[PDB]
Amino acid sequence: DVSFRLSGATSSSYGVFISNLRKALPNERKLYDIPLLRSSLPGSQRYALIHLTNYADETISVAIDVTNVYIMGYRAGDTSYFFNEASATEAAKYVFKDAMRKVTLPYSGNYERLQTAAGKIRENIPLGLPALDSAITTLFYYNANSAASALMVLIQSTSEAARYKFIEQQIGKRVDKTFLPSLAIISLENSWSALSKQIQIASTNNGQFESPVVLINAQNQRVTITNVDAGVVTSNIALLLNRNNMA
Numbered sequence: 492d493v494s495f496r497l498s499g500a501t502s503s504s505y506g507v508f509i510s511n512l513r514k515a516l517p518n519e520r521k522l523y524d525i526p527l528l529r530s531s532l533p534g535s536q537r538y539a540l541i542h543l544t545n546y547a548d549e550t551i552s553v554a555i556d557v558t559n560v561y562i563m564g565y566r567a568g569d570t571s572y573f574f575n576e577a578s579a580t581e582a583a584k585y586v587f588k589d590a591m592r593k594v595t596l597p598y599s600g601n602y603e604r605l606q607t608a609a610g611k612i613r614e615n616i617p618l619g620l621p622a623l624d625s626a627i628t629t630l631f632y633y634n635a636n637s638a639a640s641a642l643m644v645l646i647q648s649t650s651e652a653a654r655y656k657f658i659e660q661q662i663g664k665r666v667d668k669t670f671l672p673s674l675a676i677i678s679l680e681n682s683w684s685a686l687s688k689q690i691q692i693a694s695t696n697n698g699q700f701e702s703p704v705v706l707i708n709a710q711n712q713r714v715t716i717t718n719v720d721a722g723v724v725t726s727n728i729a730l731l732l733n734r735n736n737m738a
């Protein structure tokens with residue numbers, strides 16, 4: 492398992508947390524020095540627990556699928572909560588088995604559903620370590636109507652930070668304040684699957700993408716990425732989704 496404690500947290504200890512999270516994920520290949528995640532794992536190998544404790548020392552345990560870094564669900568005390576999606580109901584066979592209450596949330600973990608549920612777009616939801624503390628409290632004392640927003644903070648602070656060094660750094664920086672994510676952060680989140688696919692193709696195609704990926708940069712300009720010498724590939728993306736999880 493991996494653990495993060497918010498009381499006494501710093502930029503450093505968040506980075507340590509995100510390094511350990513990445514290290515928890517199995518990979519057989521690296522392409523261009525980036526971990527390629529596995530295609531398929533048996534159930535007893537597929538999930539990892541991360542334990543998160545907020546400033547008030549309230550803890551939740553979050554189950555992630557190690558093949559795609561998706562959050563399956565979380566446990567707060569004696570109740571477990573799973574997303575309403577097939578991989579999450581598969582996971583519920585293996586994780587949090589001793590939990591007395593299990594609730595299935597009214598939505599999957601995909602952003603279009605979550606934003607609809609939250610009634611807020613990603614750009615308008617604060618991130619930063621204090622936002623993560625607040626998300627843990629909101630899920631700990633589960634309130635259906637705050638949950639969606641909190642799960643979006645949770646996913647971006649764990650999954651998305653693990654996938655990209657830029658997102659890890661932007662979040663870790665904000666120790667005692669919060670910030671609204673730019674479109675650069677959102678475009679990376681949107682494009683993880685496509686980038687992963689093209690980087691796998693590139694390795695068979697002399698480092699050239701078969702199809703460009705349009706990202707938005709730190710200056711908000713739409714940029715078209717076509718090969719593995721682009722900075723997003725060289726210096727940012729930290730994990731690759733296996734083409735077999737692209738369909």
Ligand SMILES: Nc1ncnc2c([C@@H]3O[C@H](CO)[C@@H](O)[C@H]3O)n[nH]c12
Nearest residue numbers: 561562563574600601602646683684
């Ligand atoms: N259970 C889950 N956990 C995390 N992310 C997602 C998603 C979303 O699918 C995309 C994968 O990069 C991105 O929009 C991500 O948050 N669907 N299901 C998920």
